[PDB]
Ligand binder design. Structure first.
Ligand SMILES: N#Cc1cc(-c2cccc(C3(CN)CCOCC3)c2)ccc1N
Ligand SMILES: [Cl-]
Lengths: 19, 353
């Protein structure tokens, strides 16, 4: 499912800004 | 047409009143922008209680003003680290913006000062913590709940854009919830005065507009794209574009394709397709009718914009609050002492702070 794909991305925590 | 006489007259009048409000707000902002406040407290005026968040050059702490007992959030920036990480201009700019803006969803700077080692900005304490935590815990927000927050962002961006400020740092991690359930925007390091275009690559992968990814000159329309990402994530529980690695996220963002959960209403999907529009000549917020294309969209038909601004709408969610100084809605961080060196560091560069 899309939710499972979100979990699989590893990007469920706080996201940093680039550089 | 879509409106009869009374409704059309009321909408027209409301839109003219917004113009009148924004013209006064700009005059007030420009006065403070030209004559900023400075040096309004000192460190031993406060007890440091607990760290609310950290970053690569600074931390934010809950503090208590000793004489009054009032709680505040104090951002502490290490001058030498700010220099090393190339953040002088952003740091001075953030303080200058915070001193000059005034809006119910923008955090208020109560004091600022500096010492031999650090810069300090003492702001309102916002006890409900980050939207991010509530969203991940609840999973997703129902459409009315997402809409309540979205409306506040729409008004906040309408205000900022009237001042020629682009925001560029929207995401749930950077939105706090106050004791009444309303939004507070706190971070202005990436904001810039831009009447026309600007070029810096900055932001967070999931929230970057295509024109930023594609290394174009861009304008305030990037904030309307980011609003689309935020509304989607609030209502779905996950953002529209995600992948293991940023490059794969960027490929999805620029593709012109977005998919929606089956529980999204048709009104929400229509709004999101118009905000998450790769083509700048078609993106809501960037057309001849400006912010009105967003505010007058069917998804916002139940939104009383003035009541939101006046904070007279009952919030859908009230964070837990055990009392003044309660930090339960923020994460726990390792605490570190505040060392003030015997030698001033970096005086000239921070003269304006
Ligand atoms: N109350 C309150 C309050 C809290 C913050 C805060 C809290 C947690 C993390 C952060 C950051 C991420 N947005 C990460 C650390 O550097 C600043 C930005 C900021 C800022 C200003 C305030 N007035
Ligand atoms: Cl996290």
């Amino acid at each position: 499912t899309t939710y499972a794909d979100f979990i699989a991305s590893g990007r469920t925590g706080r996201r940093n800004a680039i550089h | 047409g879509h409106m009869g006489n009374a409704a059309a007259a009321k909408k027209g009048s409301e839109q003219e009143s917004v113009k009148e409000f924004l013209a006064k707000a700009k005059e007030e902002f420009l006065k403070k922008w030209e004559s900023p406040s400075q040096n309004t407290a000192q460190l031993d005026h406060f007890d440091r209680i607990k760290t609310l968040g950290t970053g690569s050059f600074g931390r934010v702490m809950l503090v208590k003003h000793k004489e009054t007992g009032n709680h505040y959030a104090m951002k502490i920036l290490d001058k030498q680290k700010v220099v090393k990480l190339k953040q002088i201009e952003h740091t001075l700019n953030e303080k200058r913006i915070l001193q000059a803006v005034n809006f119910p969803f923008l955090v208020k700077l109560e004091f600022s000062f500096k010492d031999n080692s650090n810069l300090y900005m003492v702001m309102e304490y916002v006890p409900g913590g980050e939207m991010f935590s509530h969203l991940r815990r609840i999973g997703r927000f129902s459409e009315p709940h997402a809409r309540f927050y979205a409306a506040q962002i729409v008004l906040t961006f309408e205000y900022l854009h009237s001042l020629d400020l682009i925001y560029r740092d929207l995401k749930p991690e950077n939105l706090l919830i106050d004791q009444q359930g309303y939004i507070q925007v706190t971070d202005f390091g990436f904001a810039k005065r831009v009447k026309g275009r600007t070029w810096t690559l900055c932001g967070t992968p999931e929230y970057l507009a295509p024109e930023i990814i594609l290394s174009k000159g861009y304008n305030k329309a990037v904030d309307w794209w980011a609003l689309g990402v935020l509304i989607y994530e609030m209502a779905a529980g996950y953002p529209p574009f995600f992948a293991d690695q940023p490059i794969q996220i960027y490929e999805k963002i620029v593709s012109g394709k977005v998919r929606f959960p089956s529980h999204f209403s048709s009104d929400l999907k229509d709004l999101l397709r118009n905000l998450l529009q790769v083509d700048l000549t078609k993106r809501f917020g960037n057309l001849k009718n400006g912010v009105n294309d967003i505010k007058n969209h069917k998804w916002f038909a139940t939104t009383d914009w003035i009541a939101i601004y006046q904070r007279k709408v009952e919030a859908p969610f009230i964070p837990k609050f055990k009392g003044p100084g309660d930090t339960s809605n923020f994460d726990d961080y390792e605490e570190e002492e505040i060392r003030v060196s015997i030698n001033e560091k970096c005086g000239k560069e921070f003269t304006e702070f």
